[PDB]
Amino acid sequence: LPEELNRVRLSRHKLERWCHMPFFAKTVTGCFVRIGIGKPVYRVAEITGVVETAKVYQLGGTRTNKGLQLRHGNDQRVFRLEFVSNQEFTESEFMKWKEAMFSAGMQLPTLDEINKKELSIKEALNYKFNDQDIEEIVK
Amino acid sequence: QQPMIYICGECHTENEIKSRDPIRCRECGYRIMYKKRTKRLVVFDAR
């Protein structure tokens, strides 16, 4: 279903609050994003890890140069956090992603996996900043 | 769902400070910050 898959969709507004929070390669790795390719067609890709690009760009108020190593079945390349769209996974895009996953041979994540992963972002959002992370954030 | 937004001292940049947290700005890092105007009906009589 597309509705259950949009629960872990990391929109463009949520990523602005974890630009410098540690454990970025743990809570983010697992979710899906609607990266814009470019005309209005979109392709859902899996978050394999985290990379850092040499180009510095501003995204509204804040500004980040980090990348995002994504993959859509087999075709993989470097992307940016500025091309991500806030739209939800449509039926056509959902079917396209399902077909790409089936063709690439990657087993579809089980429903319980998404159910237990969606809580990661929720518990990270209300995380108290009691440790020594503000120093690294300001740096 | 009000996280008690604040305004930094010198940056004048909004910050979300909750209870049991240090009082510092999201960037640079200072120790002074003020509050924002209330949302109540501030109504005066031009007298």
């Binding site: 470019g38 739209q87 | 769902q1």
Partner: peptide, 17 residues
């Protein structure tokens, strides 16, 4: 205050660049 999108703020594309 999770995501005040209200659509969005004109999201750029990859090939457009």
């Amino acid at each position: 205050t999770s995501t005040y999108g209200r659509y969005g703020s004109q999201t750029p594309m990859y090939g457009s660049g």
